[PDB]
Amino acid sequence: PSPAVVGRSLVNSFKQFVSRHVDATYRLVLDCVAAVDPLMRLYTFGSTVVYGVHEKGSDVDFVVLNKTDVEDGKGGDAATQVAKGLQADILAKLARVIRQKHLSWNVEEVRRTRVPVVRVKGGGAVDFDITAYRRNGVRNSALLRAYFEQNPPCRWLSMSIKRWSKQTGLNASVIGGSITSYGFNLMVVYYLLQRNHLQFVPPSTIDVSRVEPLPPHLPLEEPADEGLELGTQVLDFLHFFLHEFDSDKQVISLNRPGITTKEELDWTKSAEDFARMNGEKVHYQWCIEDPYELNLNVGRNVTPLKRDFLRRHLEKARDTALLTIV
Ligand SMILES: O=c1ccn([C@@H]2O[C@H](COP(=O)(O)OP(=O)(O)OP(=O)(O)O)[C@@H](O)[C@H]2O)c(=O)[nH]1
Ligand SMILES: [Mg+2]
Numbered sequence: 495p496s497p498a499v500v501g502r503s504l505v506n507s508f509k510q511f512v513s514r515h516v517d518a519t520y521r522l523v524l525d526c527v528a529a530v531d532p533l534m535r536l537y538t539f540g541s542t543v544v545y546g547v548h549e550k551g552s553d554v555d556f557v558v559l560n561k562t563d564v565e566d567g568k569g570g571d572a573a574t575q576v577a578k579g580l581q582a583d584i585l586a587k588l589a590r591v592i593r594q595k596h597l598s599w600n601v602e603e604v605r606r607t608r609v610p611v612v613r614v615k616g617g618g619a620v621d622f623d624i625t626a627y628r629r630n631g632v633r634n635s636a637l638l639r640a641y642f643e644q645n646p647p648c649r650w651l652s653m654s655i656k657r658w659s660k661q662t663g664l665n666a667s668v669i670g671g672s673i674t675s676y677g678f679n680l681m682v683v684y685y686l687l688q689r690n691h692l693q694f695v696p697p698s699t700i701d702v703s704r705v706e707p708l709p710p711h712l713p714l715e716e717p718a719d720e721g722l723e724l725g726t727q728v729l730d731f732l733h734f735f736l737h738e739f740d741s742d743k744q745v746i747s748l749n750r751p752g753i754t755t756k757e758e759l760d761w762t763k764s765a766e767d768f769a770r771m772n773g774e775k776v777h778y779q780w781c782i783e784d785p786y787e788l789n790l791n792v793g794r795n796v797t798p799l800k801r802d803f804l805r806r807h808l809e810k811a812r813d814t815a816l817l818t819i820v
Contacts, residue, residue, distance in 0.1 A: 495815060500728055501721025503815035504654050512716055514548040519622060520556070520708050526591045527558055530584070535559045537707045539635035540623075541656075544642065544679060545649050546712020553613075553621035555635075557628055558584065559702075564629075567703030570786065571628045581626045582610040588624065608772050629702045630786045634676075636705040637748070637785060641683045641692050643712065648691065650717055651727045652682045658816035662807045664800075672800040673780070677792040680782050684746040685731045688738070694751035697785040728816060736808045741801065746793070747783035756781055761791060769794075780804060 495503075516538070524536045540555030542548050563569075571577070585603060589612045592601045599620075602613045612624040625631065642649050659665035659678050666674040673681075686692040717724045739746070745761060747754035756762055761769075761778040769776040771794060779801040782792035796804065814820060 495813065495819065497725035497729055498720070498722055499725065499819065500815040501717065501719075501723070501725025503721075503818035504650070504724050504728065505717050505721035507657075507818040508650070508653075508716075511550065512714070514711070516542055516548050516554055517708060519554055519620065522596075523556055523622065523624065526588055526595060529591045529595070530587045533561065535561065535564055535707060537564075537632045537702075537705070538709070539631040541635075541675065543632070543635040543709050544638040545653070545714070546639065546642070546709065547649075547714050549653070550619070553623055555631060556622055556624045557631055558588065558624065558626040559629070559632075560627070563627055564703055567629070567701040568698065569629060570788070571630045573788065577627070578610060581628070584626045585610050585612045585624065588612060588626075606772075630784075632705055633700050633702055634697075634785055636702070636709075637695060637697055637700045638679050638683060639709065639712075640695050640700065641686070641748075644692050644695075645686070646712065647715065647717060647723060648682070648686055648727070649714060650724050651686070651731060652679055654724065654728055654816050655682055655731065658811060661817045662811070664804060664807055666795065670800075672795045672797070672804070673782070673793055677782050680748060680785075680792060681735070681746050682731065683748055684782075685734050687748065687751065688734065689730065691727075695748075697749055725815070729812065732808050732812050736805060736812075741780055745781040745783045745791075748785045749783055754783060759783065759789070 520538060527534050527536050537557050537559055539557060541552050542554050589601050589603050592614060599614050599616045604611050604613050609625050614622050655678050656675050660668055663670050664673060665671045683692060687694060743755055745754040745756055745759060756778060761781050766775060766778055776791055776794035777797050778791060779798055780793035780796035784790040784792050
């Protein structure tokens, strides 16, 4: 359809959500963290921080950090077995404390993943993931957040994409899903950057020693042009990814303004034979460079097949206003 039609469907689709006690979740978690270690810091990251708002159906991401991790505000995160072991170790203590203080909660220690994480589901729609000793999630969320702060309404584009990604089965949170919400944000910002709707923010300027453990709410204003900006952005975003982004040659990257190529990163078919992560093949079909992790393709799970599904969906999204006009 047209931007306006899409815009209105989209604003229409978000009516129920435009109407948030995370400090409380934060404090409960800090209680636990405290009981495992009173000198440990708790940082929030993920969508809550990125958007400055807490969405229904979205967990809350927390990472636990030592004073020195924070002071080393711009240090990278060790990608070693020992670093992974240190994290699993502290998270197991914390998991223990969580369970002890909240017999109601399902506290799962997840090892399937690249980053040790403790997943808590209290049942009361209460959901959070806890990781440790890593600055990269707070850092890249502070980066995404700073991008959205430049153009607060672009958050609708992001949220529209996020929700859609989960409805089409593209989001890694869904079985068969290949790109995390995080990947989708990187895509959105990258897109916003290519259209000069955002000004480039060198990732190295983000300093963890300067981010808030719990950043402030960032009011989300309804798109008050009936969604025309959004509709136009969505359509443009869909078009950009089906027709301007050259997935075979380019990398969605926020590490530099402009274009990043697969060749300069050695993210080639050749590399696929070697590149492995979490004991599996990394794919370089849909390349999304993580701004802070070395050599990490956020689209590493996008297999040739999933790449085709992404194009299908991106094409479909155009004529369904991201599955809203139905
Ligand atoms: O591959 C990843 C995935 C996630 N992350 C980090 O973990 C955070 C949470 O990762 P999510 O994919 O859960 O993103 P999100 O919070 O924005 O969205 P939803 O839960 O609502 O689906 C992201 O903001 C990012 O900082 C990574 O660093 N790398
Ligand atoms: Mg999250």
